[PDB]
Amino acid sequence: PDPDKLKKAIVQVEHDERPARLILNRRPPAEGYAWLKYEDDGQEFEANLADVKLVALIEG
């Protein structure tokens, strides 16, 4: 019942100049990496977080 609260989130980012999101429920094999998905074509990949730009946090 809290309209301020997000039960689930989607973290949108940019990688290789294209829009993507974090896969929050996949375990990165090592610190400073994460799995991501491109929003334009759905491909999943791993990236060094140093190379990912944060864009938006929205309600999932």
Q: Which is nearer to a second copy, 27 or 41 (CB)?
A: 27
**What is the residue whose two structure tokens read 């190379």?**
51
Q: Which is nearer to a second copy, 3 or 42 (CB)?
A: 3
d(CA 34, CA 56): 17
**What is the residue whose two structure tokens read 């990949």?**
45
Residues that bind a second copy in the complex, under the rule CB under 8 A: 3-7, 9, 11, 13, 22, 24-28, 31-34, 49-50, 52-59
d(CA 39, CA 14): 10
Q: Which is nearer to a second copy, 33 or 38 (CB)?
A: 33
